[PDB]
């Protein structure tokens, strides 16, 4: 088996910058015959299927932009993006097309760096269809922050609750490099009605004092 090895594993660049990644073959991919180096590069964006970028070490397929460029021959190959863009955030794979099995290198994750920005917070009381079902979920969305570290606290009439809280982040936005997070707390239809003031509190470098959003069960 040829053993494809990629590096670095991840790379923090700035929109605008110009990156270079490596893919080293453990045996030669160069065809004497044809004088083609059988190396391909795929790009996989979050939640999407891989997309081909370049066959034979440098031909670029139909539609692939030319900020992408693949040089190299033999056992050392590199890919470069120049003036990387928000939409270039993804995992880049390199694969062997020389001999079987056609093995894939392990990835190069391309994360983006950017201006700090504060969450936007919103909160939603449980909903009639759910209460009926006799369950209650309070959701709070914190969207478009950067950096990704944020702390959300839920308070019921002023006390903090940790049990029944699911948090979750989106990946950097492909359009603004930002993150989004959603916190949802599940109570019984009872626990729900026992109280009236629910508060979602987020803490983030962006502010000095917590962003707080609240609601009153009756209203």
């Amino acid at each position: 088996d040829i053993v494809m090895t990629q590096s670095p594993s991840s790379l923090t660049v700035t929109t605008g910058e110009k990156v270079t990644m490596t893919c080293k073959s453990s045996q030669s991919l160069l065809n004497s015959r044809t004088q083609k180096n059988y190396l391909t590069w795929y790009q996989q964006k979050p939640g999407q299927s891989p997309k081909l970028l370049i066959y034979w070490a440098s031909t670029r397929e139909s539609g692939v932009p030319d900020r992408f460029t693949g040089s190299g021959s033999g056992t050392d190959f590199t890919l470069s993006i120049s003036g990387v863009q928000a939409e270039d955030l993804a995992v880049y794979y390199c694969q062997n097309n020389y001999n079987y099995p056609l093995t894939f290198g392990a990835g190069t994750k391309l994360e983006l760096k950017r201006a700090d920005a504060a969450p936007t917070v919103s909160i939603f009381p449980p909903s009639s269809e759910q209460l009926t079902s006799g369950g209650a979920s309070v959701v709070c969305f914190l969207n478009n922050f950067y950096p990704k570290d944020i702390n959300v606290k839920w308070k019921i009439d002023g006390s903090e609750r940790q049990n029944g809280v699911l948090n979750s982040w989106t990946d950097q936005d492909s359009k603004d490099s930002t993150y989004s997070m959603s916190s949802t707390l599940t109570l019984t239809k009872d626990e729900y009605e026992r109280h009236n003031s629910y508060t979602c509190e987020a803490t983030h470098k962006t502010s000095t004092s917590p962003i707080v959003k609240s609601f009153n069960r009756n209203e």
Partner: protein
């Protein structure tokens, strides 16, 4: 638009086996060499095997030879992956792909998510999230479903700007997901907002309109 289409998430009990399928759309299978690729959760890509629809010869990773089998039905322009004696390690999204000269383009299918487990499939409850009594943001909650994935979109594809979907989380061995959408405030509730959710593995679909509260 030439495209490759695939089958539709499934849950299979350990020890059983599944037949995933991959059809061409607006071109013909004999015109390409079809590959199959596995991708495990958070893992990287693994080539499984490749097929030649002209002769029917298939070639694999020695690694998958005893579990994998590619077959083709050149008459219905469909290739197939029959995985057998399934395990936990067989839980992944499986893609099918092929280079097509004429378009100078490698078409990839959308993947077919296979979950190996003895749990039961349970369809989601979806709930519309209206705001509390310029821009106003809404959301949908998809709750208590298994196995993944679910497809959630708004105004069935229209409204796609400033939409955010959150990766699903487990808890009870059921998943929960939510998505929010921020729009300009004239829009709602002038122009109606609808959250469309589909859970392939249980073949259920749901439309929920977000009305004001």
């Amino acid at each position: 638009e030439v495209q490759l289409q695939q089958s539709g998430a499934e849950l299979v009990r350990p020890g059983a086996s599944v037949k995933l399928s991959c059809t061409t759309s607006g071109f013909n299978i004999k015109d390409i060499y079809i590959h199959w690729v596995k991708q495990r959760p958070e893992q990287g890509l693994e080539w499984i095997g490749r097929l030649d629809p002209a002769n029917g010869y298939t070639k694999y990773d020695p690694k998958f030879q005893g579990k994998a089998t590619i077959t083709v039905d050149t008459s219905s322009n469909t290739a197939y992956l029959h995985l057998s004696s399934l395990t936990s390690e067989d839980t992944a999204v499986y893609y099918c792909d092929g280079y097509y000269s004429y378009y100078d383009m490698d078409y990839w299918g959308p993947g077919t998510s296979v979950t190996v487990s003895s749990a039961k499939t349970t369809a989601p409850s979806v709930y519309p999230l209206a705001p509390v009594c310029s821009s106003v943001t809404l959301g949908c909650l998809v709750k208590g479903y298994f196995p993944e994935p679910v497809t959630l979109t708004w105004n069935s594809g229209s409204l796609s700007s400033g939409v955010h979907t959150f990766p699903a989380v487990l808890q009870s061995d059921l998943y929960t997901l939510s998505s929010s959408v921020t729009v300009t405030s004239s829009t709602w509730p002038s122009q109606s907002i609808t959250c469309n959710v589909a859970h392939p593995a249980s073949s259920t679909k749901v439309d929920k309109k977000i009305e004001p509260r």
